[PDB]
Amino acid sequence: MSQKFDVVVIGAGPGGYVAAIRAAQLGLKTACIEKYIGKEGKVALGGTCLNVGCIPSKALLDSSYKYHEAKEAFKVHGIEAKGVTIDVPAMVARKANIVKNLTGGIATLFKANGVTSFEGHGKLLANKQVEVTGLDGKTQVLEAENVIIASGSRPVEIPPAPLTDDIIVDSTGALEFQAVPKKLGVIGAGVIGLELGSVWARLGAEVTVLEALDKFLPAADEQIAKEALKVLTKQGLNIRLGARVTASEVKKKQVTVTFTDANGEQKETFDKLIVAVGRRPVTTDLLAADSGVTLDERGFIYVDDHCKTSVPGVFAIGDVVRGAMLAHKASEEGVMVAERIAGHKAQMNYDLIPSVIYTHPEIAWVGKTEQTLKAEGVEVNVGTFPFAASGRAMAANDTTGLVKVIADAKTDRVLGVHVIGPSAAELVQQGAIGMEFGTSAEDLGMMVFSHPTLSEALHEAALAVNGHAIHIAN
Amino acid sequence: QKFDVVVIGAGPGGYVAAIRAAQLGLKTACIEKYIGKEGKVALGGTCLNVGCIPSKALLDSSYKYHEAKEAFKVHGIEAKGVTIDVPAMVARKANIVKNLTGGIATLFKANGVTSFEGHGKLLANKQVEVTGLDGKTQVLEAENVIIASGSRPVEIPPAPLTDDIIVDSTGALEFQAVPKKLGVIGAGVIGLELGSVWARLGAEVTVLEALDKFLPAADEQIAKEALKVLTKQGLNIRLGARVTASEVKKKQVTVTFTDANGEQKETFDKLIVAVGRRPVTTDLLAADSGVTLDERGFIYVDDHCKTSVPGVFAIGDVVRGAMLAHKASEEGVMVAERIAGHKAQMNYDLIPSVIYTHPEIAWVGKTEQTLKAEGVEVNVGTFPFAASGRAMAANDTTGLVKVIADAKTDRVLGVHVIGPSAAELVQQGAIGMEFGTSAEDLGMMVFSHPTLSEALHEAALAVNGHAIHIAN
Ligand SMILES: Cc1cc2nc3c(=O)[nH]c(=O)nc-3n(C[C@H](O)[C@H](O)[C@H](O)COP(=O)(O)OP(=O)(O)OC[C@H]3O[C@@H](n4cnc5c(N)ncnc54)[C@H](O)[C@@H]3O)c2cc1C
Ligand SMILES: Cc1cc2nc3c(=O)[nH]c(=O)nc-3n(C[C@H](O)[C@H](O)[C@H](O)COP(=O)(O)OP(=O)(O)OC[C@H]3O[C@@H](n4cnc5c(N)ncnc54)[C@H](O)[C@@H]3O)c2cc1C
């Protein structure tokens, strides 16, 4: 029985580790297999998000912002912070210690819940048998009643900019720089590139972001994206749209990138270059030829709306399957799959998954953009409120940005909430909770919002939908 | 001199009522007497001029200084020193107040509200006498009157305001230097906020509180954590300490008070009287206006803020209910809408409370102790910020979220937070409660990761024993 489990989970990222905990909570005998070696030379749980993704990036964003504010936005308060500096090794070490604590915390949760951990590489064979290759190279086979595949993702590689020495790096290396890159190039103006560029720009890097697409943040609401581009450019992110990298050359501890833009061939030289074009699903040695599990043309594991693969009792969740490649999407899929194995008719809502970009100002949204609703032919009413009119934001010395609420013009149902500014993600979550209950704009308007709080900007934007905000002209 | 609506007072109640009435097409006047820093009438009431906004401005500046002094090294951030210039900090606050008070006048002009400068008094038959700043009078004929005269600090005989030594909250927001030893009478929201400002800047702060129980309206678990954290921050909060006398000598003040061990004395450079707030009706009502006051000096109104006189309403701090700015403003909206013919109502059950200490404290709905006293069986779920990845990244892990749900129906009955973004997380809870959320409803929603909001999600899951990120 040592080798028999009700649920075997391959991977311990946000998808897999949450699925494993939930399965154990539901009374299923659960194993979770993980191969990733952390900084101490031992297996570290938590996946991309904890080890080289969400948490490390937010740690560096928060440290670098605190330095930036001390250097550039203290005098208005009367604060004199003389000769303020930030030590990059110490900043990175704080991040490493946070990662170590949280990865240890997952192991603590596994122990408390009775999840059995295996260290090594898992491979799905036919008929729900899972071969585990341990760290010593020895194999064993686990007999699973159900398998949850949660093998995650890795950075996209591009031929013009292969990882090279410590000069051309991906996001993992960008979270490990021990000195500020004097000239930093970033390929890709999506969330990851914008966050990483912001960290290092705050510390003095001169940053160019090369983006092949003509449109900035095309999935975000256009009004939000336009303000974001303006603000981030002013902060020193030299974001170049319609700029397609074709070659790179490393010499003298620098890298020269050749790229094509509207004016032809261009060259620019950097001390470090981050390739942040996107993310790809990981299926390396994951599926035996006889497993029965199929991949789509983009390399994701094919699953249905309940994350079931083509093989009964085999599920796949998170970044290895279709849908938004986000940590909270992966974890909610894990919960849904575990609940369904336990017999519950659990159903995931894919329409209210929020997005957050942890720049400062923060950017977040839920639901549909104005441009999507126009393409769908839905008439809408829009309300906005700027943080420049927020008393709380004035006290905070942080008045950039706005809240936008989009409602159906016929029914008043809120269809999207979009924010750039302080506490964007928390205000968007307020909107998402309302949308879960079918809120109208008038419903939000009729609620008591504490004063003074940043939340009031959502209240006013909801009132503005129907032309009766108090604190701005309508 | 004829108006559909005459509003007395331009604080959060009155100025919002005036704007909403004007938006509804009612010919609206608003009367205000308060003189701001430029020597002219300033709108916005207590909250904008000497209350909410100034206090938050000094709290935010002082916290940024505190974090630089005490919580930068862990990030790798060093400095040769950090100082704060108190006059400059206060001047930033004064400029914010000036901008926002000007903004209300701009809103009045855009909406067509007519302003009068002076003291408004309700006479018989809905006539309003306005005494101008030169003492000359005129009478306005009002179809409807909205009384929004607000509040002022409570004065106590044993600590009368004196020179620059014994002050109320208004004086405490105007210190031009850090007091070396600062005494505060009253450990409520105002006293804790003001004490926090000056403690962060180096004052030795004692807070004398007559009640044995700290923050009795807050949930007991939150209040216990708050007392521990604020004491650690240097607020020497003395419970069961009743002030009986004070004496000023040589620009210092000795306070006599009684505690469990008998009569005590303590000497301070400055003393803040922050025991509470009282409704203002000074010269507000003619003897035959028809409007009645209760025994505590509030104007008596029904649940629609209607007085004993038809067409006369009263809102905000001068009437029953929570003395909070968002309560006053929403009452103003209700009254304006009702004058315009709508059967508008006010929800008194989900008014949140916020204390802008750091960590911030906020809550909505009922406490565990209230529900026990009511005999309502409950399930409780909590989640600590020490287990939040977002909070760890923020270097700010003090506190917790608490969700209380009915044990039979699973309906959320209260949400209580001490920690980062407490007010925003409480607002999430309040929105859910408006829609009748259960704890499981919140648990089934997708919360972005990593965000502080996830602490509310986990606490909601913990109600029914299945949080993912803490043992159940
Ligand atoms: C720099 C960066 C910043 C990000 N910021 C955020 C953010 O703030 N918020 C957000 O929502 N998302 C963010 N993301 C995306 C987020 O990291 C992913 O969406 C999330 O980690 C996906 O979770 P998952 O469990 O599907 O996969 P992963 O987190 O990739 O976990 C997969 C696990 O499977 C292991 N594994 C793979 N194959 C095997 C095998 N055969 N046997 C054993 N183990 C195996 C891997 O070692 C890994 O631990 C960020 C990503 C990056 C790179
Ligand atoms: C230090 C402090 C901090 C505070 N912090 C907060 C907080 O963060 N959040 C919150 O919700 N609440 C806070 N409050 C409470 C908040 O200020 C009040 O709840 C709110 O201002 C009440 O609004 P109101 O319109 O009823 O009265 P007020 O704001 O007091 O306005 C009444 C107006 O009427 C004027 N007036 C009175 N009589 C007349 C008359 N006869 N004729 C003409 N004009 C007249 C007054 O000059 C005044 O401008 C704070 C209060 C203080 C003292």
From TrEMBL, chain A:
Q: Name one GO molecular function term.
A: flavin adenine dinucleotide binding
FAD/NAD(P)-binding domain residues: 5-334
User: What are the annotated disulfide bridges?
Assistant: 49-54, 49-54
Q: What residues form the catalytic site here?
A: 451
Chain sites annotated for binding NAD(+) 2: 192, 211, 245, 278
Q: Which residues bind NAD(+) 1?
A: 191-192, 211, 245
Q: Subunit structure, briefly?
A: Homodimer.
Q: Hey, which family's this protein in?
A: Belongs to the class-I pyridine nucleotide-disulfide oxidoreductase family.
Name of the protein in question: Dihydrolipoyl dehydrogenase
